[PDB]
């Protein structure tokens, strides 16, 4: 009933290999029964749940900023394989609720 598609910034990220890369997923909740998921489009062409909070490869992490709406989707020690298209999604724990998919973003790993 409330269309609250999270925002997922920035659109493109360039980081040198070995440097930590962090995104920002912002979701304005209507209830506290909700989870945020961290997705990448695998070579299988599928949304791979990289991490999620509330709670894998610890190299992809998700942190809740104490502001109440913004979470940091972070990939430590970024590797050239990590390049691709990512997104975040929030699932309200409501009886029939589902996934609200944010817009996608790109990560690019350099030398």
């Amino acid at each position, epitope marked *: 009933r409330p*269309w609250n*598609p999270p925002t997922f910034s920035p659109a493109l990220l360039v980081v040198t290999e070995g440097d930590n890369a962090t995104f920002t997923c912002s979701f304005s909740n209507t209830s506290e029964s909700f989870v945020l998921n961290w997705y990448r489009m695998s070579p299988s*062409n599928q949304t791979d749940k990289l991490a999620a909070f509330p709670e894998q490869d610890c190299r992809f992490r998700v942190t809740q900023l104490p502001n109440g709406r913004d979470f940091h989707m972070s990939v430590v020690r970024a590797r050239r394989n990590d390049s691709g298209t990512y997104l975040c999604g929030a699932i309200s724990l409501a009886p029939k609720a589902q996934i609200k*998919e944010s*817009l*996608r973003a790109e990560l690019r790993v350099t030398e």
Partner: antibody
Amino acid sequence: EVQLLESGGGLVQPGGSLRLSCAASGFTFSSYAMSWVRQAPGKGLEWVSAISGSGGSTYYADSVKGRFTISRDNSKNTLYLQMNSLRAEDTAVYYCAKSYNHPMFDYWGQGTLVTVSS
Amino acid sequence: DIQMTQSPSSLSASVGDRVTITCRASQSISSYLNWYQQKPGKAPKLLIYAASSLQSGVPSRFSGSGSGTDFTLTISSLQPEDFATYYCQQDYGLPFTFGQGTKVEIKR
């Protein structure tokens, strides 16, 4: 230059089924959500269905709930709407519209006309 | 639902006149409202997004303004090819709702 075109519309009888397709080009089809919107002649526009980018979540209006099913193929870059138990009210030209999440219906196809008559 | 009432239903103005279309919502939709141009027998065209932002490729004469419930579309200098029907739609919540529609007619 995003291009969207519909296909599969024609004369359908009360009840029965009919499948609609929307061929997408000019953008990455998986990145933005897709939706359907119908408009009976001499009537306003009506939201009917919507599907997420990956397709993990589908959304339906209460009028078409339990009868229409929206679906997506990402390799073919095409949006499908499987319409079941069609009624005379369902007669309308349906448009496939890309969704920028909030800025919904950002681009519109010309739409295909579905006639529900015996 | 978020009831959308769009006033007026039709209007007639000559070339170069300031036209005004009012979109009124049942519940507040923040700034999530979009304006669409539907020429007769054609697909709708996005004009204004986020209540007041102007879509690329849309002439600057179309202007959007609105906060809360009532938003407004305004054409600076009406042109002959601007004959179309204009709808307002919210992006706040489901189900997505449009207005009745306002038919703008050119005067000659």
